[PDB]
Amino acid sequence: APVRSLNCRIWDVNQKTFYLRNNQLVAGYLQGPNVNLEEKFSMSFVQGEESNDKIPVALGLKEKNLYLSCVLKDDKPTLQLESVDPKNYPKKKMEKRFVFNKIEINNKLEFESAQFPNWFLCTAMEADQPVSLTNMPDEGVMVTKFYMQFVS
Amino acid sequence: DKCKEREEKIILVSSANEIDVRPCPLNPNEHKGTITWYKDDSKTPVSTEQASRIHQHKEKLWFVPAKVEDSGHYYCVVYCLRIKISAKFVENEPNLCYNAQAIFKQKLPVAGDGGLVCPYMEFFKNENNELPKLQWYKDCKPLLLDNIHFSGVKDRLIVMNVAEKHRGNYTCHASYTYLGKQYPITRVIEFITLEENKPTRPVIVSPANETMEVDLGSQIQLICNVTGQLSDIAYWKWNGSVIDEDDPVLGEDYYSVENPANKRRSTLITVLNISEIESRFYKHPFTCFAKNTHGIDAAYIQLIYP
Ligand SMILES: *[C@@H]1O[C@H](CO)[C@@H](O)[C@H](O)[C@H]1NC(C)=O
Ligand SMILES: *[C@@H]1O[C@H](CO)[C@@H](O)[C@H](O)[C@H]1NC(C)=O
Ligand SMILES: *[C@@H]1O[C@H](CO)[C@@H](O)[C@H](O)[C@H]1NC(C)=O
Ligand SMILES: *[C@@H]1O[C@H](CO)[C@@H](O)[C@H](O)[C@H]1NC(C)=O
Ligand code: NA
């Protein structure tokens, strides 16, 4: 491959897992046969900052060609899923909207938007709400820490 | 103009004889208006009288308490939207304080402090916005929340120094006041621990700081062979720069294989393709880096004229 890419499962530190509702990524709690609804991710090692703290990554939905991306919506950094052409994606130089700086401390992961520094991938306190981005990860408004498990 | 119709795919399994609440599950985006609730295939809305066992209040559907016989579908009618919702209510298994069908699986890596979370407590808050205090059990035996081995904060249980023996089925119990009457609430969580995410450095097997005679104008490939975890990354640099992906003469291909025997000693192979040896490449070494959160190894090949 022209990009190093790994299958994983990602869950937040409130034990919520991701799934699709309409066409949006939400976070919640699944039981029994509903665990089928869980989305796995393909995590690619893309180019960006060269640091001992951060590894730039893009996050795709396993086998659906949907990428997590940070875009301005009404003057506010917003997480949106983007359909990509499998013919070109994933690649080493992903556009900056797809790029997250993965930061790992103590088995927990934060994903900072490359495009929007100081803004972090996050989920709400309540179940079943869309995944989002926030620039206030130090107040316990949103959840901005995650665990991951590589499944390849 | 025609009512739109959606069928919700989460089936939430709750306890018989416990209070429960269901919100009509719109995304923010598909909000907007009067929310009525209906039972089964009635086109007559549910009781709005809070005294009745099943009723509508604050656009939510309340079971006060639920019964196994309530299991079935319900519609919430929020232009129009009408969502079929199916719910299941279950008795505990015999001699148990829960039913395995209601299990929420949760997992933490060994060796840290980590949290379990009692789910779907959102709607049991008391003004001023507090949850009732939760008691926590493992396999139906009480836990001491002494802030040394376990802590209870709001909806969370903090398990301190997570280890393998913490595995088991945990229940969180609360008592909620609704119309001056008290109702029990439990959720059950199957707690699974994962192997220690354990801090080690990648080993670069090849190259090993060596020279290589090559002809000017020709082509070559160099292999960086790294022993490590699949999650480590192995990549080349030249003259202080990553290999640019639009670079017209340098390219990388990344391959990997999982070692079944030892997941920590898998292999990464990054092949650098030099489609034409240019004279500049003889001035600086090609360096393979092998990287993860705890550190970096580096080893190089220096091209020389024959
Ligand atoms: C939890 O309970 C279920 C059924 O009673 C059982 O399959 C499972 O082995 C239990 N899990 C743990 C981790 O103890
Ligand atoms: C990579 O290194 C290991 C040495 O332990 C070896 O088993 C494997 O053959 C090497 N592969 C290549 C392609 O260099
Ligand atoms: C290495 O890159 C530097 C910095 O951009 C550049 O000025 C120099 O020409 C390069 N060295 C060689 C031999 O190309
Ligand atoms: C090989 O080369 C690298 C890059 O200069 C150096 O960091 C490393 O220590 C060298 N390894 C050995 C065993 O000399
Ligand atoms: Na329960």
Ligand 3, atom nearest to B283 Cα: 13
- Complete edge-to-edge strand list for the sheet that includes strand B20-23: B20-23, B60-63, B54-57
Assigned token pair, B33: 């208006």
- Burial of residue B287, with CB atoms counted within 10 A of its CB: 0-12 exposed, 13-18 middle, 19 or more buried: buried
Smallest CA–CA distance from A147 into chain B, residue: B108
Are residues B120 and B175 part of one domain?
yes
Q: What distance, in Å, lies between the first and last C-alpha atoms of chain B?
A: 81
Burial-class residue B7 by CB neighbours within 10 Å (0-12, 13-18, 19+): exposed
Domain end call among B179, B196, B213: B196
The answer on B208 and B173 residing in a single domain is: no
Of the residues B249, B278, B280, B286, which should be mutated to test ligand 3's pocket, given the most ligand atoms within 8 Å of the CB?
A: B280
Domain boundaries, chain A: 1-152
Question: Shortest CB distance from A107 goes to which of B109, B156, B256?
Answer: B109
Polymer length of chain A: 152
User: Does the C-beta of B8 come closer than 6 Å to ligand 1?
Assistant: no
Note whether A149 contacts B: Cβ–Cβ < 8 A: yes
Partners of B61 in beta bridges? B22, B56
Contact flag A34-B242 (C-beta cutoff 8 Å)? no
Which residues make Cβ contacts (< 8 Å) with residue A152, sequence separation at least 6? A6, A7, B230, B258
- Token representation of residue B116: 């379990």
**Are B75 and B127 members of one domain?**
no
DSSP state string for B217-246: T--EEEEEEEEE-TTSEEEEEETTEE--TT
Distance CA B170, CA B35 (A): 35
C-beta separation of B61 from B53 below 8 A: no
Q: What is the DSSP letter of B209?
A: S
Residues B186, B209 share a domain: no
Residues B177 and B222 in one domain: no
What are the structure tokens assigned to B202, written together?
A: 């990648």
Which sign, positive or negative, has the C-alpha torsion A29, A34, A36, A39?
negative
Whole-angstrom CA distances from B32 to A80, B57, B73, B234, B244 are 22, 17, 23, 51, 49
CA–CA separation, B89 and A58 (whole Å): 41
Same domain for B186 and B95: yes
Q: Write down the architecture of domain A1-152 according to CATH.
A: Trefoil (2.80)
**How far apart are alpha carbons B282 and B272 in whole angstroms?**
16
Closest CA to B290 of A88, A80, A128, A4: A4
Chain A residue with CA closest to B99: the answer is: A32
Q: What are phi and psi of B291, to 5 degrees?
A: -135, 140
Task: Round to whole Å and give the CA distance between A131 and B78.
Answer: 23
**B193 has which bridge partners?**
B108
Give backbone dihedrals phi and psi of B170, rounded to 5 degrees, phi first. Answer: -105, 140
Residues of B in contact with A107 (CB under 8 A): 109, 112, 197
d(CA A110, CA A122) in angstroms, rounded, equals: 9
Rounded-to-10 torsion of CA B33, B36, B37, B42: -130
Helix (H) or strand (E) holding B196: none
Distance from CA of A76 to the nearest CA of B (A): 16
Question: Last residue of some domain: B196, B219, B242?
Answer: B196
B165 lines ligand 3 (CB under 6 A): no
User: What is the rounded CA–CA span in Å between residue B202 and residue B209?
Assistant: 16
Domain boundary among B151, B175, B196: B196
The answer to whether residues B250 and B244 touch, using CB atoms and an 8 Å cutoff, is yes
Contact A24/B126 with Cβ under 8 angstroms? no
Q: Is B168 in the pocket of ligand 1 (CB under 6 A)?
A: yes
Please give the structure tokens belonging to residue B159: 């398990």
Beta strand B210-213 with B295-304 is: parallel
- What amino acid is encoded at B5 in this protein? E
Query: What SS3 state is found at B11?
Result: coil
Q: What is the CATH number of the domain that holds B166?
A: 2.60.40.10
How many distinct structural domains can be found in chain B? 3
Distance CA B182, CA A11 (A): 34
Of A6, A33, A106, nearest to B112 by CB-CB distance is A106
Which residues in chain B are followed by a discontinuity, with C-to-N distance exceeding 2.5 angstroms? 78
For residues B139 and B119, state if they share a domain. yes
Q: Which residues, 6+ apart, have CB-to-CB distance to B258 below 8 Å?
A: A152, B230, B266
Domain that holds residue B249: 197-306
Q: What is the resolution of this structure in A?
A: 2.2
Record the tokens describing residue A119, joined without a space. 């803004």
Q: How far apart are the first and last CA of chain A?
A: 15
Deposited experimental method: X-ray
- Asked if B105 and B162 sit in the same domain, the reply is yes
**H helical segments located in B53-177:** none
E-state strands within A24-96: 24-28, 41-45, 54-61, 66-73, 76-83
Residues B187 and B147 placed together within one structural domain of the fold: yes
8 A C-beta contact, residue B285 and residue B263 = no
β-bridge mates for residue A28, sequence order: A17
Q: Which of B236, B237, B233 is nearest to B267 (CA)?
A: B233
Contact at CB, A34 and B25, closer than 8 angstroms: no
Q: How far apart are CA A120 and CA A112, in angstroms?
A: 4
B210 shares a domain with B182? no
B283 lines ligand 3 (CB under 6 A): yes
